């Protein structure tokens, strides 16, 4: 099945897409495949930032966000080999876990 599937919740501008080397500024909530929340940037009350191309995130995120335009809100369905795969994320994310994110691309720094 598909490494990451991206589905629009609300559109972005349709024009401004991340390039490698740019910092993406993002709000997100992450859930297991059965819907159990395990994290939200909104909780720690701060957008999450990362640089595309710098290998800083799981591949579901690198490949997912890269397909969003600024302002877009997407649903990212990530399969295990684009997330934490076999090992999983000790005590938080089981092995072979599919992950769903609700992601908003706020701006590009």
């Amino acid at each position: 099945s598909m490494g990451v599937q991206v589905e629009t919740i609300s559109p972005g501008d349709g024009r401004t897409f991340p390039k490698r080397g740019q910092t993406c500024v993002v709000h997100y909530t992450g859930m297991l495949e059965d819907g159990k929340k395990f994290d939200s940037s909104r909780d720690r009350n701060k957008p999450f930032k990362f640089m595309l191309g710098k290998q800083e995130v799981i591949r579901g995120w690198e490949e997912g966000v890269a397909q969003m335009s600024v302002g877009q809100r997407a649903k990212l369905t990530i399969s295990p080999d684009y997330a934490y795969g076999a090992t999983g994320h000790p005590g938080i994310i089981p092995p072979h876990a599919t992950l769903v994110f609700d992601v908003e691309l706020l701006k590009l720094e």
Binding site: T23, S41, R44, K46, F48, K49, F50, M51, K54, E56, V57, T87, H89, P90, G91
Partner: protein
Amino acid sequence: AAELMQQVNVLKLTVEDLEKERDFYFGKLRNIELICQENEGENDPVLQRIVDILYATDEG
């Protein structure tokens, strides 16, 4: 001939090693995190700068 099986069995050791070490650091970070969430009510500027690192990318 198929000495690759020796290369293969070596690599498997490396991943069991690396995964143990990864899990260990991660476990420490989680625990430091709960230490913070057990004082997340002290409007503390130092503990807050540690929760920032906790969810940052080493880039920033």
